[PDB]
Design a protein around this ligand. Structure first.
Ligand SMILES: O=C(c1ccc(Cl)cc1)N1CCC[C@H](O)C1
Ligand SMILES: O=C(O)c1[nH]nc2c1CCCC2
Ligand SMILES: [Ca+2]
Lengths: 213, 222
C-alpha cells in the first residue's frame, strides 16, 4: 500500500452529549477533505420534550451565527439538509442567509443535517420524482438508480466514504442511509465533547490504510 | 430480548480460500454450508426473520467465472433448501432485481417461494441480485406508477406511504445486522430496513462462522 488516499466526504454522528467541530473543519481544509456532513438534529429528536427541542433550536441558531464569519474567513460553503417545514421561521431565514452567502465557496462543503433522517431524505427524493411524473416531465418507466439518486440530498458531493460515530453505539441511526452505502464505518467510545483532532486524523488514516484500527 | 429480524453480510469466502491455499472459488463452496446450523438455530430460539446477502447488485461486476459459480451455487442452494423449509416450517423468500438473473433460476425461486409461502415459524429471505439502492429506486418507481394511474397524489408521498413499497415491508425492521470478514461497511445491503439496526462486525471469515459466535451476537443485542 504505497498511496494513502484520505476520505473525500466524511460524515459524523456526534453522539455522547447526554466548539469540538471547529478544529475538525480546519483539519479537513488542511488535509484536503472536500466535504464534512454532521448529524445535528434528527427526525427522531422532535419526539424529545418541548423544552429540550426549544434548547436545541437556540443552540442551532447560535451555532449558525458563530459559523457564518468562519465560513467567510475560510471560504467554506455552509449547507443544511433536512425537513425545514417543522423548524422556526427565523431559524429557516438564518439557514437561507448562511447558505446563500457561502454557496459559491470552494475550499470545502460543511453540511449540517437539521430535522433530518435518511428515510425522510429518501421519501422526499421519491416525492420529487413522482411530482416530475405527474407534471409530465418524465415517464415512471425511466425511474432507476441513475435517475433516482440525483434527488437524494448531497448527490453533487462525492459519496460519503467515511462515517464516524462517537458515543460507543454501533448503529447508523437513520443518518445518510443512501450516501454512506459504501462508507467505511468508524466507531469510537469517545463521547462527542471529548472528541479530538488527533482521533479524527486517526479515523482518516484508518480509511487510507496508513494506520490500523 | 431476542432480535426480531437478523440480517447477515456473509463476507470472507475468497479471503478464506487464499488463507487455506484452496482452489479458485472453494471459499464459496465451503461457505455455502455455514448457514444451515444458523437457520436451524434461528427457528429453535424464536428469531422471526433471517435475511442473507447472497448476491449483490455490485456482484454482477465480479469476474464472470465467479458470477457463474455463484449462479450455480444459488441454484444448488435453493433445491437443497426446499425440503429443509418444509421440515422446519420456514417461509423462503427472495429479494432483488430478478430481471438480471437467469430465467431458469427465477422459475426455481418462484417455485420455492410459492411452496413455502404458508409456512409461519420463520421467514428466511435470500437477497439475490439485490442492492438497497435498487430496492429504494424500485419502490420510488412503483409509487410513481401508482401516481400515473391516478391512485396516489404525489403531494401526499411521505415516509409512511413510501415504506410500503420497499422490500420486506410486511416483516419487522432489521434490528440486528451481522457482517463477517473484518470490513466495517453496510455495502449497499438493507439500507432502509436496517436504518436503526444494531451492528455486529467480526473478523471471523464466513466459512469459519459458527452458531456459537452467532448466538454470542444475539446475546450482545440483549
Ligand atoms: O451463503 C449462501 C447461502 C444462502 C442461503 C442458504 Cl439457506 C444457504 C447458503 N449463498 C447462496 C449461494 C451463493 C451465495 O453467494 C451464497
Ligand atoms: O467475495 C467474497 O469473499 C464473498 N464472501 N461471501 C460472499 C462473497 C461474494 C458473494 C456473496 C457472498
Ligand atoms: Ca410509462
Amino acid at each position: 500500500s504505497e498511496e494513502y488516499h484520505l476520505p473525500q466526504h466524511v460524515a459524523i454522528i456526534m453522539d455522547g452529549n447526554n466548539n469540538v467541530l471547529d478544529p475538525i473543519v480546519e483539519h479537513c481544509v488542511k488535509t484536503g477533505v472536500r466535504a464534512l456532513t454532521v448529524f445535528a438534529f434528527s427526525s427522531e429528536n422532535w419526539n424529545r420534550p418541548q423544552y429540550e427541542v426549544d434548547l436545541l433550536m437556540k443552540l442551532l441558531e447560535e451555532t449558525i451565527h458563530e459559523q457564518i464569519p468562519r465560513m467567510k474567513k475560510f471560504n467554506i460553503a455552509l449547507r443544511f439538509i433536512g425537513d425545514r417545514s417543522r423548524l422556526p421561521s427565523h431559524l429557516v431565514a438564518l439557514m437561507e442567509d448562511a447558505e446563500q452567502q457561502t454557496a459559491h465557496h470552494d475550499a470545502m462543503t460543511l453540511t449540517i443535517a437539521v430535522s433530518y433522517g435518511g428515510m425522510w431524505d429518501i421519501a422526499n427524493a421519491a416525492k420529487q420524482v413522482a411530482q416530475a411524473v405527474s407534471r409530465g416531465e418524465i415517464d415512471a418507466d425511466q425511474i432507476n438508480v441513475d435517475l433516482f439518486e440525483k434527488y437524494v440530498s448531497l448527490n453533487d458531493l462525492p459519496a460519503v466514504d467515511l462515517l464516524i460515530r462517537t458515543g460507543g453505539d454501533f448503529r447508523i441511526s437513520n443518518f445518510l442511509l443512501w450516501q454512506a452505502a459504501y462508507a467505511e464505518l468508524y466507531f469510537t467510545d469517545t463521547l462527542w465533547p471529548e472528541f479530538t483532532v488527533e482521533e479524527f486524523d486517526h479515523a482518516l488514516n484508518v480509511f487510507s490504510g496508513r494506520e490500523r484500527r
